[model samples]
Target: NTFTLGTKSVNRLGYGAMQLAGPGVFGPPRDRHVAITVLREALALGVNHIDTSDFYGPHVTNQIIREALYPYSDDLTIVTKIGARRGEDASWLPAFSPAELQKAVHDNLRNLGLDVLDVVNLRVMMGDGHGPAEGSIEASLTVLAEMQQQGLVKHIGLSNVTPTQVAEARKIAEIVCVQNEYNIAHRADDAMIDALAHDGIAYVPFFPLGGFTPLQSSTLSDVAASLGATPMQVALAWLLQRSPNILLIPGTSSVAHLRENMAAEKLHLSEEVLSTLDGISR
Candidate 1:
């Protein structure tokens, strides 16, 4: 079955809030007011779909979100994830225990000022060198399912999960979306994205601009120059042209850059340009 988010009939071409955090995603912004503007401008630009999490700024982003648009728009879909916490050193730590998950959900409810969360993702802990015990996938899903039954969460999602994990999650509940690290630089999940499209589920690419890997492709620059577009624009256009189910969530701190990112919607890539990009990703 094709998946839809919140009360919307269509799959989202959304914006991500991960980058709204301070440098290195550690703490609150140096200029709190400007951070509030980013959220407001995103809404003004007809972007009703937003993806955020409590881990961002370790709870600061959601607070800003509420302050920016507390009387939230009915059309807006605010999706948040749980199961990870930020440390003093700005690194991520996993905590998917039932108690932690409950706390995270309650925190979201308080910060976002929403009675029911639109969507909550079970952030499966990958093997980080910190030696954190890997959370039990079964137990995590059970918690999410129980929360949904209690009207705390309206929908469920998964992040940083394998295909097998996705399958296991679906058996427990309807998996509406999967957030993964996919971009032109990282085509590792291309096959899984194809599977997701086949299943009518949306595949949201987290880092569209090469991720942490620096995007220094001469080909991308050359293509951008030829088309009179930025390399990031070309990259985003490529993702949009690559698949119908892809939901782009590029983040930016500057409203000017944010508007530039939003303008990628007007870019229409030719079949030749897309094929060339496909070759470049290899």
Candidate 2:
């Protein structure tokens, strides 16, 4: 089992529900039945951590999760993010005000069929949609702290935040995880990951296999070929071995693809391969 988020013990490899939404994460998915099947298969395959957001499909994704996995498992941990809302055009806009944050939490609860959220991340989206930016997350995090006390949220987390911001938020409440853009190619959070590990907080990467673009490299392909695994699988295994506190929430809409992602947990890379893979970021 991976580290505990509040009282839930989850696996290091989890599932993300972003892809369960429609194109641009705006409307309903093309095939809702298939989406339901994927969630069931993931759980049957041992995925207990599910990352989602109310803004994803602007409430579509969470509802799909409810339709698929409501009456949730005792071991399941559904980690959702608040701090942004979806526009009519599917553009992401900041919703950091106390009212917005509170509504976001309640939206998630009703949509996901939960009385209280498992882990609600206050995403500080101030960057170029890639990494953390310098800012004060106090006001927003304080709102979430109050909501937590009100019994709407169980635990809190941060996303798209700087190390400085993480420290600032810590003063107000306990942060259980840090979700950000990280992958084999993006090693900007190397130091942050280690620091969170020392503190026993989970570090979840949003785009484990490179968001939208997907991860591509000759070395990754070569390594995957030699091990009879796919490049995405190697990318995930590298992440699993990167740190113990690093939990993965790789998203996929297909059961076949979900299985491919879960298989990474069993893919063992030798130190030599890990060393070679380490140079990709250089």
Candidate 3:
């Protein structure tokens, strides 16, 4: 039920603060107080790993996190990412330079009220294409490593990186986790997940339920119905059973959704159901 991220062990079923952001991921949620309750309920359910970014709500989500969970939990690990900034127009703009990266680290530090962060993911922006932006990662990874060395950040992680880019990053620093868009329908990172598991690293699927489409499929639906669980929970349970190194950060803004997601922790699948879920993307 737990996965090793940096020096900390976090529950495989954790929370993500992305959906807490308003439209365009630029501003705060419609109900700020409600967002606070959702975060508290996550802790009430024994969640420990929290995925967030300063770029999210342009620092609104983190501020609310501190408001709700300040003083925080000893077992909680706040895993955040940098390398992108929100524009005034609410666009995701890259901020990969050494100075920009350094500023991002400080931004997370001040907002979260932590002297040092547990894990910081260096999110690689998709260059020209939506798929893996194959290019040099040395520059960005090296800067994040430098931040780690300076005690501002404890562990370094990667997001939106190709296998080659992940390999290239290791030459620069020690990576604890790799966060990317992987789900039951998106098996593109299957090989990478297995490889990272072999090395005892965590693989976090950002959009585990397949973001916009909400993961439409007859196989998954039938499996969920047969198991007496929701499709989202079935998908999450599949991820939990997918690989020990795979950590899920399924995000939500509603308390009911958070409860449903947390309930996924115990929804065990059988060999037959697993086989069907496996073929979902195939």
Candidate 4:
């Protein structure tokens, strides 16, 4: 998956740092040092684009990343998002005020041990903090544009945004990427995915494994068996073959899972199998 953003090109198969967060992705990992190893292994496997957010672990994931790979290795494009926070009950809530956005930049800089944020996505509030919300799209884009001008954010991206929101953001500034909830079973944004591909913007799908309910489909299981691949590998291979613009960032807390995910890159699927997996999302 090739996405042309500015002058840089990124491999579609990136790494997501949300799973490196605490128990429920709200605090530091139970074994903070092991979390560092997971990140190192990801880099060793050739994953250059790392996606993260300030709200993960309430700032713990960023801290761990800094510890693991501070001073950042070469060609590693770290994208951290803002616009959400954890409440006292450990529940998630949206916070996209101007101050919060700016603070997120500074906080990520400090946590990641960097002076500049490579890429920052204004995570728009979706639904009642559960799904994609039609509201707050314009307001969040305005804040992101201002941040970009201030040089805190090198590029702007929209997370949980629709195609209309992408169009709106594009009018204000060139949106480098769009992170949405997409996968084989969950394909509410397939049309949007196609649009991003046409526009040549990075389309990073956060939960490529259908989150908690992954591998629940018998169809997926049957396909995996036929291909002599695990359901997760089949899911990722299908994604890599799905579209040139579709990037995979399958996150995991364990090294075993991380290695398994990287191995998916070596599994080449045939055109007939690719067509079968592509149609299941329909």
- Cα lDDT tens digits for candidate 1, 215-234: 44787887888899988888
Clashes of each: 0, 0, 0, 5
Estimate TM-scores for all models: 0.92, 0.96, 0.96, 0.93
Model 1 segments beyond 4 Å from truth? 1-3, 10-12, 129-136, 211-216
Minimal lDDT window, size 10, model 1: 127-136
Alpha-carbon error at 227 in model 1, in Å?
0.8
Best by lDDT: 2
> Once superposed on the true structure, which residue ranges of model 2 sit more than 4 Å away at CA?
127-130, 211-216
- Total colliding residue pairs, candidate 2: 0
TM-score: the better of candidates 1 and 3 = 3
Per-residue accuracy of model 2 over 32-150 as CA lDDT, tens digit each:
99999999999999999999999998898999899999889899999999999988889999999989998999999899999999899998877565468897888899999999999
Better of 2 and 4 by lDDT: 2
* lDDT scores in order: 0.80, 0.90, 0.89, 0.80
lDDT of model number 4: 0.80
Error at 219, model 1, angstroms: 1.1
Residue 221's lDDT in candidate 3: 79
The lDDT-based order of candidates, best leading, equals: 2, 3, 1, 4
